[PDB]
Amino acid sequence: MTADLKSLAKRIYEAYLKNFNMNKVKARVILSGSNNPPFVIHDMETLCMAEKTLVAKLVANGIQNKEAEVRIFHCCQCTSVETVTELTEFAKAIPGFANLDLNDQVTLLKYGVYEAIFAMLSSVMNKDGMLVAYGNGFITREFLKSLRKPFCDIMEPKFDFAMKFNALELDDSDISLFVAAIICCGDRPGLLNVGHIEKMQEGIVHVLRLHLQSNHPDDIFLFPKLLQKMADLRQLVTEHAQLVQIIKKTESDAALHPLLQEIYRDMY
Ligand SMILES: CCCCCCCCCCCCCCCCCC(=O)O
Numbered sequence: 001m002t003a004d005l006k007s008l009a010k011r012i013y014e015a016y017l018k019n020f021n022m023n024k025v026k027a028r029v030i031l032s033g034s035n036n037p038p039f040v041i042h043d044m045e046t047l048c049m050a051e052k053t054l055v056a057k058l059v060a061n062g063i064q065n066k067e068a069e070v071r072i073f074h075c076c077q078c079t080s081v082e083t084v085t086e087l088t089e090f091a092k093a094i095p096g097f098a099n100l101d102l103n104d105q106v107t108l109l110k111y112g113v114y115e116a117i118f119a120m121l122s123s124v125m126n127k128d129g130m131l132v133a134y135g136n137g138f139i140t141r142e143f144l145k146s147l148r149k150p151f152c153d154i155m156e157p158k159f160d161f162a163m164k165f166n167a168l169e170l171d172d173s174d175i176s177l178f179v180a181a182i183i184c185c186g187d188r189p190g191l192l193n194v195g196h197i198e199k200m201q202e203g204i205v206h207v208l209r210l211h212l213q214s215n216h217p218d219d220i221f222l223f224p225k226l227l228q229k230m231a232d233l234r235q236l237v238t239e240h241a242q243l244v245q246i247i248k249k250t251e252s253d254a255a256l257h258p259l260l261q262e263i264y265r266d267m268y
Pocket of ligand 1: 050051054055072073075076077079080081132133137139154244260
């Protein structure tokens with residue numbers, strides 16, 4: 001007559017496999033190297049080729065097409081909007097989340113989505129580049145660094161986080177619970193029912209702790225390593241939001257999608 005934490009871990013894992021278009025196994029199959037392989041974007045010529053095949057509407061404007069860096073930033077935003085949608089459905093699997101007031105669900109998602117986005121982005125990154133466009137492109141790290149300022153400054157800190165995060169050798173069963181724990185933080189600004197959220201957090205962190213003990217017997221500090229990664233992600237998001245605001249203030253063509261503007265509004 002006690003909670004079955006192994007079963008809860010498996011429920012979370014299954015919800016992650018159901019709700020995210022990309023997972024670490026799917027990404028590794030593509031990254032390893034037969035139908036619809038990814039188109040490699042390593043320079044301006046190959047960016048423009050990939051756009052004409054994969055996001056044709058975006059470059060169908062002739063002289064009116066936006067600057068390459070702004071088109072890339074638009075594609076970044078579309079990826080975030082999609083991952084926010086996936087995370088919102090995933091959160092229903094977290095015990096207690098759907099029982100919270102709607103406003104608290106919104107606040108938890110507001111602060112958690114970008115931390116989760118950058119954690120999961122590691123799964124599609126290697127030291128040379130990253131998968132994009134639903135696994136149909138591979139854009140190089142060097143190409144992103146070559147963009148004009150400020151756009152070359154977006155992805156590099158995310159690659160740096162990801163190289164260390166990937167060295168932990170988590171699998172999707174671990175990442176799903178880490179993402180659930182990110183969403184359940186009782187210290188987000190403006191929460192109403194802090195007490196119930198703290199209990200929700202305690203519960204999911206307990207599931208995570210036991211799962212890591214079982215799945216990674218070789219790494220006895222993996223749980224505190226991941227607690228630190230959560231703090232690192234909060235700081236990565238704070239810095240990312242500051243850069244997005246610079247882009248907003250200084251780049252008139254880099255229209256910010258209204259869902260993301262709402263996420264960033266009053267965030268940090
Ligand atoms: C076919 C053309 C492909 C162009 C691919 C551009 C790269 C996509 C990167 C996806 C990850 C974006 C992470 C940064 C998010 C920045 C925007 C935001 O704040 O939501």
